[PDB]
Amino acid sequence: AGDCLLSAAFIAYAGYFDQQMRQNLFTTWSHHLQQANIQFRTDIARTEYLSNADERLRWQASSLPADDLCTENAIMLKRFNRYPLIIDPSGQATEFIMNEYKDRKITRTSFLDDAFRKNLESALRFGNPLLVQDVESYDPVLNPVLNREVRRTGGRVLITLGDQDIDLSPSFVIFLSTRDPTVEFPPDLCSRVTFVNFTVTRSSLQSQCLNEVLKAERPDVDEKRSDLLKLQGEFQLRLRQLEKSLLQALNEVKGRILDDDTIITTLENLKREAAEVTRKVEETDIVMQEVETVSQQYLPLSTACSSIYFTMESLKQIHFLYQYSLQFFLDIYHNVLYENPNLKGVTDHTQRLSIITKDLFQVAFNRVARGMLHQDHITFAMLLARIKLKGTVGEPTYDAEFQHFLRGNEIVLSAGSTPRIQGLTVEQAEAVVRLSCLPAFKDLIAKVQADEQFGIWLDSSSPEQTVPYLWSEETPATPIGQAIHRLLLIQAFRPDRLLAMAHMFVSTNLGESFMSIMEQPLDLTHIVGTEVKPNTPVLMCSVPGYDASGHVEDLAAEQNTQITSIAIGSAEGFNQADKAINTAVKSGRWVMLKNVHLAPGWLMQLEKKLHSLQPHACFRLFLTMEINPKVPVNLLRAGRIFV
Amino acid sequence: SCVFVHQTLHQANARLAKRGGRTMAITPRHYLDFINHYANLFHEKRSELEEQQMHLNVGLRKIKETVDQVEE
Secondary structure: OHHHHHHHHHHHOOOOOOHHHHHHHHHHHHHHHHHOOOOOOOOOOHHHHOOOHHHHHHHHHOOOOOOHHHHHHHHHHHOOOOOEEEEOOOOHHHHHHHHHOOOOOOEEEOOOOOOHHHHHHHHHHHOOOEEEOOOOOOOHHHHHHHHOOOEEEOOEEEEEEOOEEEEOOOOOOEEEEEOOOOOOOOHHHHHHOEEEEOOOOHHHHHHHHHHHHHHHOOHHHHHHHOHHHHHOOOOHHHHHHHHHHHHHHHOOOOOOOOOOOHHHHHHHHHHHHHHHHHHHHHHHHHOOOOHHHHHHHHHHHHHHHHHHHHHHHHHHHOOOOOOOOHHHHHHHHHHHHOOOHHHOOOOOHHHHHHHHHHHHHHHHHHHHHHHOOHHHHHHHHHHHHHHHHHHOOOOOOOHHHHHHHHHHHHOOOOOOOOOOOOOOOHHHHHHHHHHOOOHHHOOHHHHHHHOOOHHHHHHOOOHHHHOOOOOOOOOOOOHHHHHHHHHHHHHHHOHHHHHHHHHHHHHHHHOOOOOHHHHOOOOHHHHHHOOOOOOOOEEEEEOOOOOOHHHHHHHHHHOOOOEEEEEOOOHHHHHHHHHHHHHHHHHOOEEEEEOHHHOHHHHHHHHHHHHHOOOOOOOOEEEEEEOOOOOOHHHHHHOEEEO | OHHHHHHHHHHHHHHHHHHOOOOOOOOHHHHHHHHHHHHHHHHHHHHHHHHHHHHHHHHHHHHHHHHHHHHO
């Protein structure tokens, strides 16, 4: 009774809140039930109570992310009373629904589409699951069906739509989806439909990456972790069916008054199977250091992955061209765990985790920086360096040092606060007195006064290479601590070398060859060969005064691939591009679109068409473009950027 | 307990609104949906578990029959 109460409370409610809020609500309900002694089982999980093994495996085959939030969302999607409203900024929910309902030939439809009403009536007549990818422009014709106003006239279930009456089919289900996670809805909407949030929060992506690394790397020990998954699987099934077969043979009303009844010995096998289930539960108890450890060894990896991806999202603030989706980071993750030559000859597991995280950082940087201006490469490199520094456990967190390094200029000074140090300019003196606020730099002015090599170092071409020892610390510092302290010194002293010393700091953090790939030109042949999907177009966004056609032409010629190059100048260009792409989808040849920035709406239409299309594996779409804000954000999110 | 669940959902919505995050109104229609889901889940799980329980009780009565058999 209590377990069903909690299950239904979680099903009807908690459909919009994130993982932390859902857990808080569940904890509050469980605490209240405990106070009233409503006996509810605690060992069971919400993801398991309402789900079956066959359904879970079908969802896995239907490409359900392993995150427990997504499993709960699938559970709510399966059983409901009001038609769900899915919010999927990632975009995984739409493909999950399509794969799940492919057998029922679910038809896609958009509210903006004029044929939406025709698709709706077709779904009602035939009884087909229907999906609408946009509901922000809500059309109120669904108010009656959402309210389920049904009139039972004769043997007919009849729905009043507008001024027409349409027969209803029980098999018909309508699914509402929104791409925007920031949209607000009128209260009638949240009253009429239930919410199924698919927003990928920090905890959500953290758990997803943890499960992905558990499955991909450590695969037979992923089955050692799934010893918990099999304890009540193919294991307890044998116990229960052995009990029921024993019941089948228990009294067949045969051999009455017979001293021969060895069938009792099969209860020994019953006890052995029950003991197998219970001892696998005790293996889940051994998870006090078994699977909790398989999880916590990769916990830094998953935390770093979440931090990396949210840095990747928030990178859109510094420039309109830096638009990256979940699928891009997931492709990065798959390329790190799979098809990685660095682990071909590597078997040790801790070292495999170490090389995996190193290659994760390296591949993430080498994939992001290709579509990033050269003036911003050091920014993302420093962000990744900070992420790795936080991840590693030995080093101090260095919050105060980084906070000062970022917010020194906000500190207010006075005319008398500057002691007018000889050999230093006024702005330099302000920097000295400001940075002396740090406890490690309190005696800095004395070091300025005492030192005599300051004159040559301050005026040297590259002071960052030979920064002297000024900060005073009672204990020897880590190389990273020395690097950040010298970075602060360079910022306060010779800000012109700040970028170079940032390069050195990233080198100390993430390896001396972290940027070594950047100096080399783009290896377009490998990028277009593998690691890119045929559906995803290649974006070559060049600044004014430069074209990217030559590099892709050389690529096509050297691969001996026939490529159709067309320019976007007018409607004739539109028709030629459409015909070329339609031919190349099935033939597999390459097609180039030049100066695509001229038509933003046509670009949006092309993105929408590309999503629906099914390109051949050899198909590659190159969109050379000018870097202007007129380009739709959706294409940038749905394509690989190369600046 | 169900009433308290609804009240805490309202309180959580109010707290989320105070924090500044996006919130959606909770209507008594949500309470009706919760009660209906509770009814459906209770019926289904009780049906399955008690069918198995009835099988087990019939088995126990048959065990008593076998006890009588060994008795005579």
